[PDB]
Amino acid sequence: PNYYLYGTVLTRYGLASLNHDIRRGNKTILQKGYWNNGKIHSFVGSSAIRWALRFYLQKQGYLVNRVWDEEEHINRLTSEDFDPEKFYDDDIFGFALLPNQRMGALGMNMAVSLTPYDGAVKLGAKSGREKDSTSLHFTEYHATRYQYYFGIDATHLKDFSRILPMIDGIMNLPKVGGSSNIFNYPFCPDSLVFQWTNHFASYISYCFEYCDPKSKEAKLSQEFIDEVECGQIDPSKLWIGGTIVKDLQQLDNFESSPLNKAHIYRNRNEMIEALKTVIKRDLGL
Amino acid sequence: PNYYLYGTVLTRYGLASLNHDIRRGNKTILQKGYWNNGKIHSFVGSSAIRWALRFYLQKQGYLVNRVWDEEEHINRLTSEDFDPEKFYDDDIFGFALLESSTPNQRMGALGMNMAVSLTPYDGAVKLGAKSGREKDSTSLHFTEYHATRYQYYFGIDATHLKDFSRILPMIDGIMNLPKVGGSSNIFNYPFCPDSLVFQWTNHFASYISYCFEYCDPKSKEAKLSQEFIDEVECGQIDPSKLWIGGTIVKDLQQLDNFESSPLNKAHIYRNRNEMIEALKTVIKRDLGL
Amino acid sequence: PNYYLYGTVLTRYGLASLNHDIRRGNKTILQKGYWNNGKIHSFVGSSAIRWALRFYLQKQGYLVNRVWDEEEHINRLTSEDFDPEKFYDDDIFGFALLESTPNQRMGALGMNMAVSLTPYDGAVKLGAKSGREKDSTSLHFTEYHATRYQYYFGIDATHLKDFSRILPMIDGIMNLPKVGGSSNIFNYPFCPDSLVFQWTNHFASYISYCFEYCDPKSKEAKLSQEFIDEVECGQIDPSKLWIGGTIVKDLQQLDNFESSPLNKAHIYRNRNEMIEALKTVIKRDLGL
Amino acid sequence: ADNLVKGIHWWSNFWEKLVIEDSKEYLFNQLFSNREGFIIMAENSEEDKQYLIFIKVFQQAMKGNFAKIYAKTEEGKDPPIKKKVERLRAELNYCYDELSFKEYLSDFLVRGGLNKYFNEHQEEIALLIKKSPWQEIRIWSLLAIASYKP
Amino acid sequence: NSEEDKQYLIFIKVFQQAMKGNFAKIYAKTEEGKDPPIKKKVERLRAELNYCYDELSFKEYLSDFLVRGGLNKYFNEHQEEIALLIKKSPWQEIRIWSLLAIASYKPKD
Amino acid sequence: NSEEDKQYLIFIKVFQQAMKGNFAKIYAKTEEGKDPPIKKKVERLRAELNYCYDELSFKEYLSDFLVRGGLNKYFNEHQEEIALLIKKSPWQEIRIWSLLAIASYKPKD
Amino acid sequence: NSEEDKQYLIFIKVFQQAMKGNFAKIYAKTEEGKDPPIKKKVERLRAELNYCYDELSFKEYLSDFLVRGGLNKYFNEHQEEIALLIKKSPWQEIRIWSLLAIASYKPKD
DNA sequence: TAACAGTGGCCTTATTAAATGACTTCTCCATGATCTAC
């Protein structure tokens, strides 16, 4: 049976400069665009998160075709012929020769800042005296939480057991490409909405929303909550975990709401363990 | 009788790059063109949605002539001669054998129009670059994306189907559409409906094509158009043949004087599954399944 | 194994004018921006703290490629080719030689900008060149801020060329020299007064900014309720949590502290004892 | 010849017939061979000298843009005119509506440095850029690229 | 010439006068050396104009630059027209006009 | 035309009157043979305008500037309109309007 | 509409009335052929308003100012809600509103 | 009541601007010699 794991994760609050766009002149341009309300929102590309997952797989065994050298800052291919049956990297993220080309068992969308980006520019100077063209520069940061949506086709994996390391990596994401030296931003999630269903219809994409411009309270939603109440998104297939649980359980009439009978855990590790148990049972691992 | 299922379906809000065309040098251009009031919108081809429906029929286990190999990325025909009586895809989407007893072509029961972005295309682009200091001609590149909802219009000639019962899998596929051809690795855009306006009538005329509008040029609002509401008010569209489901139901119910409007007596369901179940019951009763 | 030392350090209360912005007119402004609740907080750049750490490494002997002259205010490179094996600063902070052994290094230290615990409301200090003569460079204004500062850092210990170089880095974080700013008129010691360190072997931290204020115009500081909930719910293994500083008294004054899972963490009122225990654990884990 | 027969401008459909319908720069390469014919046709134009002024402005801007990188790149590392012209043509082809094309053209003109031809014809060229359809400006930019003398 | 074209040309002249003032201020500031750069100033202006990402930021930068220009006689003569043009027009079009003014600028001999 | 445009234009007039009053006050302040300011006072006004953060500081400074301007007829006729305009509206937009008024105040003096 | 600005406007009105009453009291204070200043009264009021340092200061100051305002009718039918408005809201916002009222006071006299 | 409203120096250094392959498939002919039926 076809099984898909859709999820939207919310990162912790902090100052982020992850995805510089093009360096317009003196400024490192944080990647941004219009979103939701017609306001400019900073973005983190999905390729950055895929690179972070690749690095997580490489750092802990998990034979991978592409090996990040981490010293020469180059990628080396163990086998020039991609073999999804042996390497986790080829099996999960796919490839393209330009063959087989795979298709990619993990589909991910760009991470979107939960808050509009106002100006958030940081000045940078190089010590003192003998000033040159590189002495003065500016960098664009952003003090918000990032939110991205991913989808996994579990049946598409060459080895079904490889979905568990991917979940572990998503919950233990390494440095997502960015200015870690100056703006160290952990990309581990503090709020999760996972759906382990068996049809290609997900209504949890970018569920988290708070606007309230400059803040970090990060309420869940009203459209997603209405979707749960109306009858679809059955709570048995819904997994909610993280700091959003505290706000969810404080809502009025929560006990009588259909959202109550969803798998809701305040501890992320407990929900991950329960979800992995369900996944292993369903996939015959 | 001759029954048709017309429908306009609106997708969820997200970042989409599903409609690339011939690339201009470095940057990957997504298909776009002029639309309402002269602004440029991004279009998703209807062949993409037809391919997604075909893939849904194949995955669900229905007998399909053209089998798509996921591992090989090739298309294989189980029977070289198209047989609409036996194969779902030939019956629904038709065929046309053009090469130098059985008919060589079929008109196809399903008729679909292009998917149009609800919001005009602003011009957003995203830079991609291969990691590593060893950089070559294929190091950095640009991909255009659009943060919008896509709406598309489809029509089904139920009587044209060789087997009348095949309309139900098509509705299920429309409500459970697989990935619509695009860049799923970096722009995973779910194409499942979140707002429907269906019409199950024996009259050939349809006034529901592209009935959704935006409240603000750059916003995720997706309100029902004033022309469609006016045509419901004037009595042109029979409310008993109207099926509205999805998130637009809330906005409709918050409208002033909704209880006195003829739009009230239409089949309105917040839950899309309930609307689909009721519509399928009506369709089965009408077609005698 | 891949061991990481995350940590959030809270400074002492005092008048601060550390990191400034573009010159503008006669008034030197702080680096400020919206942080929480839509209020404007003052920031201290992480490059300033990195410079202070480099200066600490230089002062206490050690081998640093960059040598701050301290007399002509110039930077001299002992070797034009960066050698992370030999020099402490190249090993820790990395390098990037772009003008045209690898020419670039990612560095083992990752810092974030220090955020004032208190919103910045007013606090502009009038400054005069004095005398009776007056000129353009006579009347000037300098912004200050009476607040504590709090920043978050992470160390990839395995990324270090020499695994033992983490210990001088912890010592420098403890005895940090002056962080770049107008120390002549606003002397602000950046030595920590409260610490929340985590020595774990996975990438998730959940301890980014654990300190929050009470009575937004006061010097009092407390651990954020989100952090306490994170500790109590089961996440954040207490055995990997090192808490030390003046926040220890407030933590121990909490009700049901003994029954709380937070009691099982390594809690030391004296910062030196906490640092010694943490360094013992680090030396045991890294095989030093 | 077809444009002359139809009674329209001789450059009426140059873009969609010379760049869009070009497979492997087969049609594009012939522009630099017909550069002399382009120059003759522009010089002996029956009317519309303002767009020849625009040709001069765009050629000066192209000279500045190319010279920037050619000074950045030393001998041996200097790429031929072919690669830069191909990149410029691709960037021109990227533009899809009036706003994007005019933004790109204006940024290109600014990056071209000081432009004496633009300065001597401020009002005329400014009005021409603001008012004329962007497709015509793109076509004339293409044929100014074709008749560009290094 | 239509009224829109007249206001567009007046805005071009206003921006050119503002650049004259800013470059004169720079020249006075860096009189030292063989000669203050001119191409570098234009590149700085282009980069700063391209940095703007939304209407508010671009209009803030444009107003700041115009004020830094100085007297700007063409703005003296056309308060209401130019003010309404800046307030109303989309920021992308105003940026296009500003860059056209930059390109069509003649440094004083 | 349009109410918002009229309010914006007459707010520009209000700000220009306020700057006239402040500059007259500066003129009265200086004495003897020292040259009274003309342009560097405008630069000081610009620097004070950009030295602004959050809604509170800028509105405080704007109100203080308007009061220091003294008598002004444009604010006299329109109390409710300008009071609402200043109290409402983002402070950055009002700063943009103030800078636009600065750049076009000079035809008066 | 949205009676918050209604409260803002009638606060401005009663502030203008109170300052008119205080200026009348000052007119009573002065004597002889000396011209009673009007602009200097506004300057003194602004300086005293800027003299405060939050909460206690400027709250008792402005309450005392309104009390010396005299028989203010709009105050009389708007005692309770204006008192509630003063008790709530940040004091700097009240100062901004007061300064705007001063800047828009004259056409009464 | 007064006098000032910053004095400096920089405004990015590199690097790479795409890598493939496809560029319609069928059919509908016109006309006269001859066969053939009336």
Which E residues between 4 and 33 have a beta carbon under 7 A from any strand H atom? 29-30, 32
Q: Which residues of B245-267 are buried (b: 16+ CB within 10 A; e: fewer)?
A: bbbbbeebeeeeeeeebebeebb
DSSP 3-state assignment of C250? Answer: helix
Query: Nearest residue to H21 (CA, C1')?
Result: A98
Share of chain G residues as helix, strand and coil, in percent rounded to the nearest 5: 75, 0, 25
Spatial distance from the CA of E31 to the C1' of H6 (Å): 18
Tokens 């609307």 locate to: B275
SS3 for C246? Answer: coil
**Residue B21 near residue B136, CB atoms below 8 Å:** no
A20 CA: nearest nucleotide by C1': H12
- Going by C-alpha positions, the residue among E109, E20, E8, E100 that lies closest to residue E66 is E20
CA distance A182 to C109: 9
| Strand H close residues, chain B 125-144, CB < 7 angstroms | 128-129, 133, 135-143
How close E68 comes to chain F (CA, Å)? 7
**DSSP line for A175-240:** --SS-TTTS-----EEEEEEEEESSS----TT------SS-------SHHHHHHHHS-S-GGGEEE
Task: For residue G80, give both structure tokens.
Answer: 């309770």
- Estimate to the nearest angstrom the gap between the alpha carbon of C35 and the chain centroid: 17
The torsion of the CA quartet C55, C59, C62, C67, rounded to 10 degrees, works out to: 50
Distance of CA A119 to the CA centre of its chain: 24
Task: Give dist(CA C281, CA B256) in Å, integer.
Answer: 68
Task: Decide: C239 and C263 in contact? Cβ < 8 Å.
Answer: no
- Coil, strand or helix at A144: strand
Element (H, E) at A35: strand A32-35
The partner residue sitting opposite G107, judged by closest CB among F63, F76, F83, is: F76
Tell me, yes or no, if D90 comes closer than 8 A to chain B by beta carbon: yes
Residue F109 burial (C-beta neighbours within 10 Å; 0-12, 13-18, 19+): exposed
Rounded to an integer, what distance in angstroms lies between the CA atom of residue C286 and that of residue C275? 16
Q: Are strands C4-10 and C149-156 parallel, antiparallel or unpaired?
A: antiparallel
* E54/A40 Cβ within 8 A: yes
| Amino acid residing at F91 | W
**Cα torsion for A183, A137, E25, F39, to the nearest 10°?**
10
Residue C67 in contact with residue C76, Cβ under 8 Å?
A: yes
Q: Is the CB of A127 under 7 A from strand H?
A: no
Which residues, including other chains, have CB under 8 Å from residue G51's CB and lie 6 or more apart?
G57
Residue of G nearest to F55 (CA): G93
Contacting chains of F (3 CB pairs or more, <8 Å) are C, E, G
Q: What is the largest CA-CA distance in chain B?
A: 69
> CB atoms < 10 A from the CB of C177, how many?
18
* Chains touching chain G, criterion 3+ CB pairs below 8 Å: F
> Could you give the angle at which helices D50-72 and D35-43 cross, rounded to 10 degrees?
140
If phi over 0 gives left and psi between -120 and 50 gives alpha, with beta otherwise, what is residue G2?
left
Which of E48, E54, E59, E92 to mutate: most A Cβ within 10 Å?
A: E54
**Dihedral Cα G63, G67, G73, G74, nearest 10 deg:** -10
Name the token pair of C285: 């884990």
d(CA C133, CA C118): 39
The two most distant CA atoms of chain E are separated, in Å, by: 47
SS3 C172: helix
Encoded tokens for B191: 């194409």
The whole-angstrom separation of Cα C72 and Cα B248 is: 69
Please report the residues numbered 245 through 284 in chain A whose beta carbons come closer than 8 angstroms to any beta carbon of chain B. none
Residues of C in contact with F47 (CB under 8 A): 24-27
- Which chain F residues are Cβ-neighbours of C28 within 8 angstroms? none
Query: How many residues does the structure list for chain E?
Result: 109
Measured CA to CA, the distance from residue C51 to residue C73 in angstroms comes to 13
Among candidate residues B183, B251, B218, B168, the one with its CA nearest the CA of residue B20: B183
User: How far A174 CA sits from the closest chain C CA (Å)?
Assistant: 6
Tokens of F30: 């200086």
Among candidates D107, D127, D131 on the partner chain, residue whose Cβ is nearest the Cβ of E50 = D107
Task: For Cα atoms A218, A219, A224, give the angle at the middle one, nearest 5 degrees.
Answer: 125
Chains A and C touch (3+ CB pairs under 8 A): yes
Q: Which two tokens stand for residue B130?
A: 């291969």
Please say whether the beta carbons of C15 and C112 come within 8 A.
no
Handedness of CA B270, B276, B278, B279 (dihedral sign): positive
> Nearest CA of chain D to the CA of B123: how many Å?
8
Provide the CA E59 distance to its chain's centre, in angstroms.
11
Cβ–Cβ < 8 Å for B168, B280: yes
Q: In chain D, what's the furthest Cα-to-Cα distance?
A: 49
Please give the backbone phi and psi of residue B102, each rounded to the nearest 5 degrees, phi first: -70, 150
- Nearest residue on chain D to B137, judged by CA atoms? D83
Annotate F32-99 with DSSP letters as a single string.
Answer: TTSPPPSSHHHHHHHHHHHS--HHHHHHHHHHHHHHHH---HHHHH-SHHHHHHHHSS-HHHHHHHHH
Query: Nearest Cα to A93, choosing from A42, A150, A137, A147?
Result: A150
Taking each helix axis as running N to C, give the angle between helix E55-69 and helix E79-88, from 0 to 180 degrees, rounded to the nearest 10: 150
- The answer for A 158-197 residues in CB contact with B (under 8 A) is 177
C284 to A249, C163, C239, C287, D118: CA distances (angstroms): 42, 12, 15, 5, 72
C-alpha C96/C-alpha C86 separation (Å) is 17
Which token pair is B211?
């009935």
Q: How many CB atoms lie within 10 A of CB B80?
A: 7
Question: By the 8 A CB rule, do B238 and B201 touch?
Answer: yes
Q: Which of residues 9-38 of A touch strand H (CB under 7 A)?
A: 23, 25-28
Strand H within 7 A of C219 CB: no
Which bases of strand H have any atom within 7 Å of the beta carbon of a protein residue?
2-20, 22-23, 25-27
CB–CB contacts below 8 A, D to E: 56
In angstroms, rounded to a whole number, what is the distance separating the alpha carbons of residues D122 and A152?
58
Sequence-distant contacts of A23-26: CB under 8 A, at least 24 apart: A24/E47, A24/E50, A24/E51, A25/E43, A25/E44, A25/E46, A25/E47, A25/E48, A25/E50, A25/E51, A26/A136, A26/A137, A26/A138, A26/E44, A26/E47
How far, in Å, are A92, C241, C243 from residue C8 at the CA level?
35, 11, 10
Which residue from C110, C126, C104 is spatially nearest to C28, judged by alpha carbons?
A: C126
Q: Do B274 and A231 touch (CB under 8 A)?
A: yes
Burial class (CB in 10 A: 0-12, 13-18, 19+), B19: buried
For residues A227 and A171, the answer to whether their CB atoms sit within 8 Å is no
Are residues A180 and A15 in contact, defined by beta-carbon separation less than 8 angstroms? no
Dihedral of alpha carbons F59, F61, F63, F66, sign: negative
Min Cα–Cα distance to chain G from F73, Å: 8
Name A140's bridge partners: A121
Q: At what angle do helices D98-111 and E91-103 cross, to 10 degrees?
A: 30
Amino acid at the residue B194: D
The 3-state DSSP class for residue C7 equals: strand
| Listed resolution, Å | 2.8
E43 CA to H11 C1' distance (Å): 10
DSSP annotation string for B33-78: EE-GGG-EEEEE-HHHHHHHHHHHHHHTT---SEEEETTTTEEEES
Distance CA D42, CA D137 (A): 15
Spatial separation of the C-alpha atoms in residues D133 and D141, rounded to whole Å: 13
Q: Cα separation of B66 and B70, whole Å?
A: 13
- Closest-CA residue to E84 (of E11, E13, E19, E15): E11
Nearest CA to B280 out of B166, B153, B151 is that of B166
Tokens linked to A132 = 């040159």
- Give, as one character, the DSSP assignment of residue C29: P
Residue C239 has what DSSP assignment?
G
Q: DSSP readout, chain B?
A: ---EEEEEEEEPPEEE---B-S-BTTEEPBPEEE-GGG-EEEEE-HHHHHHHHHHHHHHTT---SEEEETTTTEEEES-SS--TTT-HHHHHH-EE-------SEE--SEEE--EEESS-----EEEEE-SSS---TTSEEEEE-EEE-EEEEEEEEGGGSSSGGGHHHHHHHHHT----SS-TTT------EEEEEEEEESSS----TT-EE-SSTTSS--EEPHHHHHHHHTTSS-GGGEEEEETHHHHHHTSTTTTTSGGGGSEEESSHHHHHHHHHHHHHHHHT-
Q: Are B99 and A19 in contact (CB under 8 A)?
A: no
Q: Which residues 136-175 of chain C have a CB under 7 Å from nucleic chain H?
A: 136-140, 142
- Chosen for mutation from D16, D23, D86, D96 (greatest number of chain B CBs closer than 10 Å) is D96
Helices then strands, counting H and E runs in chain E, come out as 6, 0
Q: Residue E51 contacts by C-beta under 8 Å, 6 or more apart in sequence?
A: A24, A25, A27, A29, E61
Which technique? cryo-EM
Q: B109 and B157 in contact (C-beta within 8 Å)?
A: yes
E strand or H helix at A42: strand A39-44
D43 CB and strand H closer than 7 A: no
Look at chain D and count its residues. Answer: 150
What CA–CA distance (Å, rounded) separates C203 from A175? 8
**CA–C1' gap, C141 and H5, in angstroms:** 9
Q: Does the distance separating the beta carbons of B25 and D90 come in below 8 Å?
A: yes
Residue A100 CA to residue A79 CA, distance in Å, equals 15
Q: Cβ(B200)–Cβ(B226) under 8 Å?
A: no
Checking phi first, is residue A140 left (phi over 0); if not, alpha (psi -120 to 50) or beta?
Answer: beta
Q: Which of A38, A68, A149 sits opposite B219 (nearest CB)?
A: A38
Contact E104 D129 (CB under 8 A): no
- Checking each nucleotide's C1' against the CA of A126, the nearest proves to be H10
User: Is C31 in Cβ contact with A122 (below 8 Å)?
Assistant: yes
Spatial distance between the Cα atoms of B48 and B67, rounded to a whole number of angstroms: 16
Q: What b/e string do you get for C203-232 counting C-beta neighbours within 10 Å, with b at 16 or more?
A: bbbbbbbbbebeeeeeeebbbeebbbebbe
β-pairing, C75-77 with C66-68? antiparallel
* Contact criterion met (CB below 8 Å) for E35 and E90: no
Q: Which tokens hold the place of F54?
A: 């959050």
Q: How many Å apart are CA A253 and CA A230, to the nearest integer?
A: 15
Name the nucleotide nearest B139; use CA and C1'. Answer: H16
Handedness of CA E43, E46, E50, E56 (dihedral sign): positive
> In chain A, after which residues is the C-to-N distance over 2.5 Å, breaking the chain?
98
Other chains touching B, judged by 3 or more CB pairs under 8 Å = A, D
